[PDB]
Amino acid sequence: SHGGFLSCHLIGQYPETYSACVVRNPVINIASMMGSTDIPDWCMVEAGFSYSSDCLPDLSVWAAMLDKSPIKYAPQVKTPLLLMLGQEDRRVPFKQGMEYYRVLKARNVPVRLLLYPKSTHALSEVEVESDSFMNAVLWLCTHL
Amino acid sequence: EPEEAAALYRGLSRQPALSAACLGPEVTTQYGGRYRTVHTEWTQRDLERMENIRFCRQYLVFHDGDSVVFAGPAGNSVETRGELLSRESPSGTMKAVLRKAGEKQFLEVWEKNRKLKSFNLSALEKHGPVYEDDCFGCLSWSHSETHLLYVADKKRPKAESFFQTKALAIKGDQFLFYEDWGENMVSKSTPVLCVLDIESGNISVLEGVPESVSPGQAFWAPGDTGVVFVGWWHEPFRLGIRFCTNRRSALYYVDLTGGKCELLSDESVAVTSPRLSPDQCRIVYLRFPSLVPHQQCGQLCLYDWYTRVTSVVVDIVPRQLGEDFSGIYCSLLPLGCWSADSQRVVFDSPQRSRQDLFAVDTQMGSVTSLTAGGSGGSWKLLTIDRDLMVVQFSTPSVPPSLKVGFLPPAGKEQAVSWVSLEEAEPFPDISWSIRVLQPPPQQEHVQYAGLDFEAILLQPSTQVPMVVMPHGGPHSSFVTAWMLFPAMLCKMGFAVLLVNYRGSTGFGQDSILSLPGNVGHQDVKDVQFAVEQVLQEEHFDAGRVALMGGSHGGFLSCHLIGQYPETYSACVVRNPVINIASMMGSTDIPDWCMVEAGFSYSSDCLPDLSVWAAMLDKSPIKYAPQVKTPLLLMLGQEDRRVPFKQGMEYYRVLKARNVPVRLLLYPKSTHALSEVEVESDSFMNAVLWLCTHL
Amino acid sequence: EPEEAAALYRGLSRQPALSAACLGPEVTTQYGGRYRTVHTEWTQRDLERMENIRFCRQYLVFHDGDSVVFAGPAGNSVETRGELLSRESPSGTMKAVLRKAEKQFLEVWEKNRKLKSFNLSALEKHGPVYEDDCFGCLSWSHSETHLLYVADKKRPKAESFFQTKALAIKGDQFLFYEDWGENMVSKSTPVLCVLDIESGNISVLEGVPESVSPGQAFWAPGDTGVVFVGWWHEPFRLGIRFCTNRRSALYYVDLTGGKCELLSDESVAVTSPRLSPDQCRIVYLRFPSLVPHQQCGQLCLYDWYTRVTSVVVDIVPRQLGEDFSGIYCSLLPLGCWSADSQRVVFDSPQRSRQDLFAVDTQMGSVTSLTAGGSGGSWKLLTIDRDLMVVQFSTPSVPPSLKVGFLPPAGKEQAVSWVSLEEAEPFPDISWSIRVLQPPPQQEHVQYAGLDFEAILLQPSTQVPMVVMPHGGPHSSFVTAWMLFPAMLCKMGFAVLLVNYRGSTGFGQDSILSLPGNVGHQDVKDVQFAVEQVLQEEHFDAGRVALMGGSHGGFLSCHLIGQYPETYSACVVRNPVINIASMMGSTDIPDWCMVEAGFSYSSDCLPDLSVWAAMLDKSPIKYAPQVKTPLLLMLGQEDRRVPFKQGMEYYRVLKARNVPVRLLLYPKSTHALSEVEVESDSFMNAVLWLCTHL
Amino acid sequence: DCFGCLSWSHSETHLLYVADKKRPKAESFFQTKAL
């Protein structure tokens, strides 16, 4: 979630420190998340503006949102990454991870993507939880 | 009145439409006469069962030489269930059918009054589900009539969980992501070519297809030595393919055994619809030379099998080539399109506001119109065999009808005589006409000067209210054919105006290329000018004008109610485009937003402030605060080309300001809303909204 | 060899069979030619989908008014799904279809359009529609404005005593409703329904007597009323399927008012009425005795305007010439009248053949249209404007389709058949007919001089033989295409099918000879036929086997019990084992009383003498003597012959330590007709026979 | 645990809880009716 956002920022801004990364449902582009999330005021508040139900698009605001998102640093990434998305998540739409995945794949960076068609943000079902934990452990033990 | 509207819809929806036709072998009699049979397939809506039913019918044609002497029916209609694909053999003695039953998929071979053979594809376990669409699917007979060729999904390795219990597969791969080809292509990721031997019943998957292409539209090469197919590039990722002709692809030939594959055309443009000639010496196909627009004017090209020479038979038309031809705009050719001499080809294409039939000589390059002149109408060519054509004809006030004809010899194709096989009853209370519009001086394009456009007006045969419809696309158009909803509106007392603004297909390549980079400014003004001219000319009631549109047509309607708030009294939209910038990151065709905004598209892009501002400046949401027209919104929750959150954002903006809005959400429908129940419900709701608010 | 047998079965089961045919309207040409279309329906087994599939085909016939000039195909076959009944209109312009899709829909088609559709379930005027040949029907009005059919009567709603209602009769949920027996599950009381096409309204006719079940209805002349057949169901119902001895009568009822009148006698059985093209007279079949389940019948005629009834064709004791022996069909073709409204055509068994006959209703003469030759089986599917469509087959030739023209009166024997669809013969099978004369010690006390027949198939000595008696016992074998006998013949066996005294098609004396003698006269006829055939063809006497079902299994058990040294193997299907125990559990209790030699009464009570006779006539009495290995195959849901009879026989044999193999099908009836069950049973039987000989 | 609850009255004779609001029934424009 907000913790996957930070991890992508870290691997984009410090390309030498880390050698592996796993993210479940990261926030990737704050500007494009506003129109699809169930809590649009979160995007406004965390970017430094006041939310209003009558507010319309304003290019000045949309500039701040883009400058604070990890996608901006995509071209500098080299760390192998594992993505695990839930297709029914309503707070963080799963297209967010897809954009990052496409950007990384266009540059031949090693990426592994798992998609759970019936899971929400938490991936809390026993089968999904066990499979995701096993895959993450295997990734970490192999790439280190 | 809901009851009267329901009765009218019941009456209008009963008219069926043609889907396919084929011809049988010739038969001789001891008296010397000659006749042959025609097989046709029809589809019809059924409101009691709430489903689309499909049935078959057969006809008889007695001919003496190259002339039709008599035609008649040969029995009653028979309903069918579970047929995906079917193809008669070259000699006409056997028939191959793909069916779903049980569900499982079966391949059946019929001869006369017996089902000779059946194969259970699921049990053999050599591949996945078979493709039945028109993009990749096919079903072809060998020239020896011993083998069959088709396309099916590639087999995936078995996977299992880390914690399975075994009795006293790759672990962890159950949820690996497989990318599919987009809207109306759910679960279709990578096809493969499959060959079935009828005698032995063994299935093989051909080897040698390049790893980075998806194959399709395959047929047997001369001598049955190999297979010719079209490959679409899917690296680094797939872009929506349905309803687009600008996807990079090429033509390949592959040997039956060995793995050798050779390229037969260029590899930088789009190609489609290859057809081998009856003499087996040449191939004709369609080529689109730029990848920018989703629909455009195309070229007709020819390839010689034995000399290996490629040539251009028909080239791009900038504005017009005479008064009858304006370019090639069809996305496919008929399955049977060659004349008996293996020198001429026949097809159908839009031409301004009509749809006509054309014959092309592949040696000289001349194009001849077979249906020129008259008031108008829409023709469709279903097949040709031994110089006998089967066609469908319709107009805005006449449901589809079936005809047959003989293609005259070279140089006299305009003297064709049509014979009727199945006629339809007209509706004399609808009258239709075509209007031509010339943009005013202040609206001329900087580089393409002098373009004009058109509209189609239907009216009963200042008192009459009017409804305005722009088409989607934006590179599409309306043609003077049978349309259910406009006919219903006309029979309820409305007048209907369908607008083909600059950028529509069938008016030259200049019209196609004039629109990009100007969406939201040029088309809106074209529609407004047409509305004003029609109002001033026919003297309709200016206080009862309404709008109705889907997809890009909804985008235009929202723009219009936002920029001219005092002109329209009601509006109905379906799956509209509302915010291009936010749409870019969620649609299956991201290149469309960039192209229509006025920029080039490339993979490995990145968000930029300038491009995002340009996209935001062209969106109808910017005018939301000015709107005061009552609005009805209808959305499909599973639409993948236009996500349903655009309409939700528009709805929230309007709701926060106390504007009257009515929202309907269909949780299992796509962009089309083509299911019988959903379609009927949406049409009834729209008609009631229009009648109540005007 | 299981693989070779499976391949042979796959090859043989591919041949389709005809089920129905109809003719279309005549069409003229500017050149003067005249042609018309023929619509046919076929059915075929599919082993991959394990199901019976049905498809349709169409043909064209060009004629000159009295002769066929050309015939040809008019397209490919089209498979169909969910069609229960269908009927073309009198003028040939519309078509009515009953479909299931589950719900039931009545549809009307005209050219390339599904004009109308009606959802019967939603209207809620009746229950499921009848689709069988006993009660079901679907008829057009002469004005082509109304439709008539038959459906189950609506039952009042019921609910439990403890239902919870939001803030019907209580206790009637499990009331018993009696049905009509085997292959008639859940069918209790039908009713006549009329649908008006223009308005959409359904009505249930009033005036049917409370104590009858109506069926086989059609519109009366002038569309004033309806003519139907009513079967008595008091005090309780007896099995109706495959029986022609159920009491019934013919009734006419007005459309509105409730007046109902009787048109025939009320003490015998009547069936199969057909109105003439001119709408002046009606023919039907009458059976005057209720004792036997099949017998010789009469053909009777009724005049609409004079109200006079007469007998056109009467019972035949032994024979009427060398070509006719009586009427033994249970139904007439839907279209059976000549264009002059004076002659009728039908098909019937005749000794060991099945022939076509034409009858003049004014003079009463019967003429055979297919007399002479080696044999064969014909079936007439329809006639319209003097054009007949027929199916033909033989033991070594699968079914074929032909058309013909009926010659004028006095010359019907000169008919010329034109082939529409031919089948490929099997030249490795040869068949013949044998005649057998019982010896002096086996003559009947009252019917002296009767002889019987057998059909012998063989490849074209050390040849093994398989013997088959038919069920019934009032039934028979005819020289037609039979799948299993052909499969056996193609594997190297010889096959002998026996028509013992009491079979249909040999006169009423043969029918009446058997009752009261089951287990004695039928067992000795079969044994005599086997002995006679063995000594003449010089087959291997040490490799003779038996195979039979129902009454044929009863005979086979009797034979292996009374002649333990003659047969080396035996296969039976749903056999009758103990008549006395059968009486109290079957759906046709009168059969046990009649075949044992007594009369049946609805108020009968158990008696010692009758029970003793039934026990003395049962094969179980010979169980201790049996030593032949046995394969027994039973269907658990059979209602005419409960599956406990075979269980008792199996228990006795097992307790005596005899080799036995038992198969039980938990969802099958007496026929074992499902594709999977049928194939499994045939393969098991073939393997048993091959291994044990 | 945002809206749901289950409560006893002090007299212990009544119960209180929360549930979704009832919605009026609807039907298609083409539904067939029992004659």
Ligand SMILES: *C(=O)[C@@H]([C@@H]1N=C(C(=O)O)[C@@H](S[C@@H]2CN[C@H](C(=O)N(C)C)C2)[C@@H]1C)[C@@H](C)O
């Ligand atoms: C991701 O961080 C998005 C949202 N913020 C949340 C947070 O507070 O961490 C989560 S919900 C929260 C986390 N664990 C609990 C939980 O998920 N369940 C009990 C199911 C509560 C939420 C996805 C953030 C970007 O808004």
Ligand SMILES: *C(=O)[C@@H]([C@@H]1N=C(C(=O)O)[C@@H](S[C@@H]2CN[C@H](C(=O)N(C)C)C2)[C@@H]1C)[C@@H](C)O
């Ligand atoms: C909306 O217009 C979006 C896309 N453009 C379309 C168009 O060409 O009109 C449609 S698809 C096309 C229109 N009618 C056909 C159809 O819908 N079916 C056959 C189901 C094909 C498409 C959603 C545009 C904004 O991208």
Ligand SMILES: *C(=O)[C@@H]([C@@H]1N=C(C(=O)O)[C@@H](S[C@@H]2CN[C@H](C(=O)N(C)C)C2)[C@@H]1C)[C@@H](C)O
């Ligand atoms: C067994 O023979 C029992 C009954 N008599 C029969 C007979 O006539 O042979 C059968 S029904 C008859 C035979 N073949 C047809 C058939 O089985 N189907 C169409 C399914 C009809 C019946 C069980 C006898 C002991 O009563």
